[PDB]
Amino acid sequence: HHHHHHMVHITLDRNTANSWLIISKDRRQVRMGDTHQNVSDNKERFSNYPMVLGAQRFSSGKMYWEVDVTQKEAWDLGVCRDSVQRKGQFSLSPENGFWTIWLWQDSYEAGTSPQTTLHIQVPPCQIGIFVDYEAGVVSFYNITDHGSLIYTFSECVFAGPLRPFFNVGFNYSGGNAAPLKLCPL
Ligand SMILES: CN1CCO[C@@H](CNc2nccs2)C1
């Protein structure tokens, strides 16, 4: 792929984070803490899952960024509508305003409804995410495997401004503590 020149500098929005997340000073890394992080509650915070949004909002154009997922067992990545539900239980689907992929239990899947099996021969350490707002496309690339395509959502009905979306996953196993990191341009 030749999407690298649409690179955008993404930072995480603390106010949207689940109350157990720890975001670095530079707002470029996030990990699951072992307890509540001593923040006040607000209507933006994801309550049920270890999720956070990027600060940036996109309503046009082409955007690209990269995320490091090294040594994680579970995570979700992609984009979502600014108006997604924050409280209670929900599934990651385009009907609910999410365009995502994930790792869970040693398999990769796209967040369609129902979910779609991904075919990845080289487990990725860094994921590239490309959004073409006008075309209605969200694509995912395997940076570890020379940029190979993982998945394309096409005919997307965004229906609002988009935000970068992250889930660091739970750490019930003790093997999923590692952070998500936004990689330098
Ligand atoms: C009372 N419910 C409502 C909120 O989510 C449920 C568990 N989820 C999380 N706990 C830690 C961080 S995310 C507990």
The CATH number of whichever domain residue 169 belongs to comes to 2.60.120.920
Contact 167, 177 (CB under 8 A): no
Q: How many CA atoms lie within 13 A of 23 on its CB side?
A: 23
The span from the CA of 76 to the CA of 100, in Å, is: 7
Contact 50, 170 (CB under 8 A): yes
Tell how far CA 107 is from the center of its chain: 17
Q: Name the CA radius of gyration of the chain, rounded.
A: 15
Contact 142, 150 (CB under 8 A): yes
Query: Distance between the two ends of the chain, CA-based, in angstroms?
Result: 16
- Which of 39, 17, 30, 105 shows the shortest CA–CA distance to 69? 30
Per the structure, the complete domain to which residue 136 belongs is given by 4-182
Tokens linked to 156: 């997307």
What is the whole-number distance in angstroms between the Cα of residue 101 and the centre of ligand 1? Answer: 22
The span from the CA of 110 to the CA of 32, in Å, is: 23
Those residues whose C-beta lies under 8 Å from the C-beta of residue 114, and which sit 6 or more positions away, are none
CB-count burial class (<10 Å; 0-12, 13-18, 19+) for 60: exposed
Those residues whose C-beta lies under 8 Å from the C-beta of residue 147, and which sit 6 or more positions away, are 1, 128, 141
The span from the CA of 100 to the CA of 87, in Å, is: 19
DSSP at 115: -
This entry's atomic model was obtained through X-ray
What is the whole-number distance in angstroms between the Cα of residue 49 and the centre of ligand 1? Answer: 6
DSSP at 16: G
Atom of ligand 1 nearest to the CA of 32: 12
3-state helix, strand and coil shares in percent for the chain, rounded to the nearest 5: 5, 40, 55
CB-count burial class (<10 Å; 0-12, 13-18, 19+) for 110: buried
Q: How many domains are there within the chain?
A: 1
- Which of 154, 113, 110 shows the shortest CA–CA distance to 132? 154
**Reported resolution in A?**
1.2
Contact 80, 66 (CB under 8 A): no
